[PDB]
């Protein structure tokens, strides 16, 4: 999971 | 927004759509190419091809279970492109590049047309 | 094999599937949650959820145009997860994390369950 | 395009  | 994003989600979805295709699950159309038949999902074909997008948004054609491609279309070229649609992988070779590019132009798959044009230009 | 791969293909396919969902094109099922209705594509739901995979591979249920979820399922939690399925983006907030995790457990969306568990553990 |  990432900060888009 | 303040969303988080799962990096591998799109790839995992496409992998699962290809597993459904392999097992012939929920396929809703047959594409006929020079008497060679390919089963697929209309939505995946639309998502990958400007031609299928136009065909399945047509009020009459959206309801067809069989689509016949132009007789000049090569079944191997189509098969390679169908595989690309469901995997992101293009089996491009010296022996098939002309058929693949001609099929990609007809199907309106601009990124495939682009790499074929570049690979052909490199060999001249 | 000796394939080349188009990096953005899977993401572009999912973006196009979400555009079809927005325009209600080729949607083939309604998911009913506490009298809230959500239109979707069976194949995308199957590709994202172990629950929908099991439902639409069932010989009788594969033919249903309406699926009713368990009444304990929260419509907002479902909406957030449906959006995630079609975009890879999860709108996870302090105010919805419990409903989102409970819905992801029911839908069998293991990666979502994992990030909810981690975000909850960080706040304790 | 890349070599996967
Ligand atoms: O090269 C290409 C690939 C491609 C895909 C589509 N598909 C869609 N476009 C927009 N909204 C939904 C969909 Cl399904 C249309 C044109 C082209 N041209
Ligand atoms: O967490 C998850 C996400 C998910 C998706 C599916 N889908 C499929 N699995 C295998 N072949 C085809 C499909 Cl469509 C099954 C289980 C789970 N569990
Ligand atoms: Cl393309
Ligand atoms: Cl997930």
Residue ranges and CATH numbers for the domains of chain C are 1-124 (3.30.710.10)
Contact between residue C53 and residue C46 where contact means Cβ atoms under 8 Å apart: yes
Burial class (CB in 10 A: 0-12, 13-18, 19+), C104: buried
CA–CA dist B59, B18 (Å, integer)? 27
Q: How far is C104 from chain A (nearest CA, A)?
A: 16
Say which DSSP state B12 is in. H
Structure obtained using? X-ray
Contact criterion met (CB below 8 Å) for C102 and C71: no
Contact: B3, C62; criterion CB under 8 Å: no
Reported residue count of chain C is 124
Q: SS3 sequence, chain C?
A: CCCEECCCHHHHHHHHHHHHHHCCCCCCEEEEECCEEEEECHHHHHHHCHHHHHHHCCCCHHHCCEEECCCCCCHHHHHHHHHHHHHCEECCCCCCHHHHHHHHHHHCCHHHHHHHHHHHHHHC
Nearest residue (by CA) to ligand 1, atom 14, is B47
Give the residue from B95, B10, B98, B102 showing the smallest Cα distance to B51: B102
Please provide residue B103's backbone torsions phi and psi, each rounded to the nearest 5 degrees: -65, -45
Quickly list DSSP for B21-56.
HHTT-S--EEEEETTEEEEE-HHHHHHH-HHHHHHH
Nearest ligand atom owner, CA of C116: 4
Q: Is B21 on the interface with C (CB under 8 A)?
A: no
Strand, coil or helix: D1 = coil
Q: How far apart are CA B65 and CA C54, in angstroms?
A: 25
CA-closest candidate to residue B14, choices B39, B47, B58: B47
Residues with CB under 6 A from ligand 2: B 16, 19-20; C 46-50, 53, 108-110
Q: How far is B89 from chain D (nearest CA, A)?
A: 8
């Amino acid at each position: 999971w990432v900060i888009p | 927004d303040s969303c988080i994003q799962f990096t591998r989600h799109a790839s995992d979805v496409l992998l699962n759509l290809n597993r459904l295709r392999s097992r012939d699950i929920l396929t809703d159309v047959v594409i006929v190419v020079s008497r060679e038949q390919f089963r697929a999902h209309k939505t995946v074909l639309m998502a990958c091809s400007g031609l299928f997008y136009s065909i399945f948004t047509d009020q009459l054609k959206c309801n067809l279970s069989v689509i016949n491609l132009d007789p000049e279309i090569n079944p191997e070229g189509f098969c390679i492109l169908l595989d690309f649609m469901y995997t992101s992988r293009l089996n491009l070779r010296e022996g098939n590049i002309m058929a693949v590019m001609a099929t990609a132009m007809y199907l309106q798959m601009e990124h495939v047309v682009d790499t074929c044009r570049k690979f052909i230009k490199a060999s001249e």
